[PDB]
Design a protein around this ligand. Structure first.
Ligand SMILES: N[C@@H]1[C@@H](O)[C@@H](O)[C@@H](CO)O[C@@H]1O
Ligand SMILES: N[C@@H]1[C@@H](O)[C@@H](O)[C@@H](CO)O[C@@H]1O
Ligand SMILES: N[C@@H]1[C@@H](O)[C@@H](O)[C@@H](CO)O[C@@H]1O
Ligand SMILES: N[C@@H]1[C@@H](O)[C@@H](O)[C@@H](CO)O[C@@H]1O
Ligand SMILES: N[C@@H]1[C@@H](O)[C@@H](O)[C@@H](CO)O[C@@H]1O
Ligand SMILES: N[C@@H]1[C@@H](O)[C@@H](O)[C@@H](CO)O[C@@H]1O
Lengths: 149, 149
């Protein structure tokens, strides 16, 4: 299933910085209001809840920058071609968050519920309304879709 | 994906009472320690998180007894052939519970962490450790499997 990753508090979406159809490794992932094919994602299941968040246009996947098993708070989110266990995430569509295998979540940098376009995303352990994400249809940004298959 | 519905606190599983391959309509669902093909389930997705919990051997699904949209506390869980919105559940594999469309959960009747074999299951709104369920492989009762597949 193809979906948009929507920041629940702002309604902005996860994008590669610059919107490239083939972002370079380590391109940052930001929040931006626009919708287009280069901000479509899919989820590739690896092990029950755990899988890779794949940028459809490039085939690169979401990583914490540096690929640590336990990235510290404020580690930037990026795209990278590599597949390994430090690029594993769970798409928690019940609590509305995205959890890295090490236990921390994807956040807007600085914690704003209404961050401006091109706000970077980072790893952080905290849970609050401004780290919530929902996973929605490219054809209807208010309709949740099932990311697991 | 075929799975066992495992009561987390006790390790017992959801069964039709009597363990038939073809339980009659309105047969109660109970907890029981045995594993066999007549306690296998599948989940048929209807709308994103919402779907039918299907008894594989019979093709009947889990209902609140009487088919309420908002079943009261202590309403019995049963199997029934019918498919409708009052037999929709969500299999919350992050919080480890099974939520009915009306917002309440599947519980062992009385809320014991170690209910005896053949304890009835019911709807109840409370959340606690004795209403948690995990969804496991028929080949490995300790291995969680993805039910949304
Ligand atoms: N035109 C795009 C815009 O839609 C968005 O993807 C943005 C993300 O940084 O990059 C470009 O400016
Ligand atoms: N070794 C890793 C690489 O695989 C990737 O996770 C990358 C993501 O930034 O970080 C490191 O360079
Ligand atoms: N308090 C918030 C924290 O929860 C997290 O959102 C962080 C993300 O950078 O920003 C702030 O420190
Ligand atoms: N033999 C079965 C047992 O395995 C279990 O399914 C039980 C559930 O009530 O019914 C019968 O006793
Ligand atoms: N008419 C309903 C039937 O569809 C089913 O939900 C059943 C479940 O017990 O309750 C009622 O008979
Ligand atoms: N106190 C418990 C309640 O939380 C619920 O588990 C209920 C289920 O029947 O049993 C007991 O009343």
């Amino acid at each position: 299933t193809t979906f948009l990753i929507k920041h629940k508090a702002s309604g902005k979406f996860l994008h590669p910085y610059g919107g490239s159809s083939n972002p370079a490794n380590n391109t940052k992932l930001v929040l931006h209001s626009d919708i287009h094919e280069r901000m479509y994602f899919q989820f590739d299941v690896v092990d029950e809840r755990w899988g890779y968040i794949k940028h459809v246009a490039s085939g690169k996947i979401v990583h914490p920058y540096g690929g640590q098993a336990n990235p510290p708070n404020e580690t930037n989110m990026v795209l990278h071609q590599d597949r390994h266990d430090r690029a594993l995430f769970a798409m928690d569509f019940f609590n509305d968050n995205i959890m890295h295998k090490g236990g921390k979540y994807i956040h807007p940098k600085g914690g704003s519920p209404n961050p401006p376009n091109n706000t970077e995303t980072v790893i952080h352990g905290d849970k609050h309304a401004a780290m919530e994400f929902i996973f929605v249809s490219p054809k209807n940004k208010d309709k949740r879709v099932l990311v697991y298959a």
